[PDB]
């Protein structure tokens, strides 16, 4: 299965959205249809291998049917900002952060993603926190950056 | 050295025989050498016959069976464990196997 991770919302005063490729995810086994009892951290920096030596970011055994489950992150980033931050690809009114490739499982939920904002004034806002789906900052020159209806 | 008196096949007093194709990998194997297996399987599983007794419109019903003859090459028969390696005195024992279901 392939899943695209979009960042959706109304963006004002924002040049780029950058995303940590670290996702707390809920996974379901495609063999026995049981949900994994805990969320699992899927990270781009986690290096695992399938039983056929293919690189994956997550390897998990289903506790019920013993089947292996695998997830690979493909970063959709166009560039790395400061060699650290994955710039999400702008697509019309949203940002494509990554593509998650599941084998032997379904991804049921992504819980949270750590998001950083580059403003149109070149200011970085690291680790932005949303209140009820809203984020807003003002600079010393009265330029506003905001995200509304975050999804 | 010669391992079997019959060269591992049932051909005698003939030049050549028809080939057949392996069920598992489609390899060609001579008919007189291929490992053979017989199957007689009910169309309906045993775990449903107690529902069939209330589902059917007829006063009584006999379930239809399905019939097959399957052929295997040596490699497949050994790997699927239809046959196994045996000791130098056991190799000579010949007995008919059961029909599968």
């Amino acid at each position: 299965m392939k899943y695209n991770v979009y960042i959706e919302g109304t963006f004002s005063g924002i040049q780029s959205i950058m995303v940590e490729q670290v996702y707390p995810i809920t996974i379901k086994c495609s063999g026995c249809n049981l949900v994994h009892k805990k969320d699992v951290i899927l990270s781009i920096d986690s290096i695992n291998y399938t039983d056929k030596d293919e690189k994956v970011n997550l390897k998990v055994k289903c506790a019920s049917c013993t089947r292996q489950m695998y997830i690979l992150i493909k970063s959709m980033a166009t560039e790395l900002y400061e060699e650290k931050f994955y710039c999400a690809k702008k697509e019309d009114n949203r940002y494509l952060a990554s593509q998650l490739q599941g084998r032997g499982c379904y991804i049921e939920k992504i819980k949270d993603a750590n998001i950083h904002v580059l403003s149109e004034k070149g200011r970085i806002y690291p680790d932005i926190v949303f209140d009820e789906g809203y984020w807003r900052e003002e600079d010393n020159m009265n330029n506003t950056s905001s995200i509304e209806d975050f999804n | 050295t010669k391992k079997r008196s019959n060269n591992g096949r049932s051909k005698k007093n003939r030049g050549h025989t028809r080939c057949v194709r392996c069920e598992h990998c489609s390899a060609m194997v001579p008919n007189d050498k291929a490992i053979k297996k017989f199957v007689v399987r009910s169309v309906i599983d045993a775990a449903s016959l107690d529902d069939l007794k209330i589902a059917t419109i007829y006063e009584e019903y006999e379930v239809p069976k399905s019939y097959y003859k399957l052929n295997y090459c040596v490699s497949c028969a050994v790997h699927i464990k239809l046959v196994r390696v045996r000791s130098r005195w056991e190799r000579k024992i010949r007995k008919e196997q059961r029909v599968s279901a």
């Binding site: 299965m1 495609s30 063999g31 249809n33 032997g104 379904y106 | 194709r21 392996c22 069920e23 990998c25 489609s26 390899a27 060609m28 199957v39 169309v43 309906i44 599983d45 775990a47 449903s48 529902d51 069939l52 589902a55 059917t56 419109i57 379930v63 239809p64 399905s66 097959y68 090459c73």
Partner: protein, 129 residues
Amino acid sequence: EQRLNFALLFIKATKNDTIIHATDLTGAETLAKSSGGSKVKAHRDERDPYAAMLATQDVAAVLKEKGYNAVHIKIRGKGGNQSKIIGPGGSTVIRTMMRSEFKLGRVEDVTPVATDSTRKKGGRRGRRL
């Protein structure tokens, strides 16, 4: 009370997928159709007894809407010069139809056997794995 209003149900059951399809007695009009691959996500599950069972329920529902009560079943594998054993899932379509209310008429195996045949795929050595 009511007479038995009958439909035909065709079932194909290969190693890869299962297809379920209801018709009038003539075979020339279609009432409902589904497959294992319609309901499930992963490609490795399209033959699964579970995917077959989910797909059967949708077909049973549409038939109950159109007002049918009883069913004749004709079932097959792939045949020809290929495999001629009924695949997994085939025998769970039938048991599911019986848990739904439907009365079962007659069952027949209708796999196309050949008296002799064209050459099979795979070459003289066969698949190596």
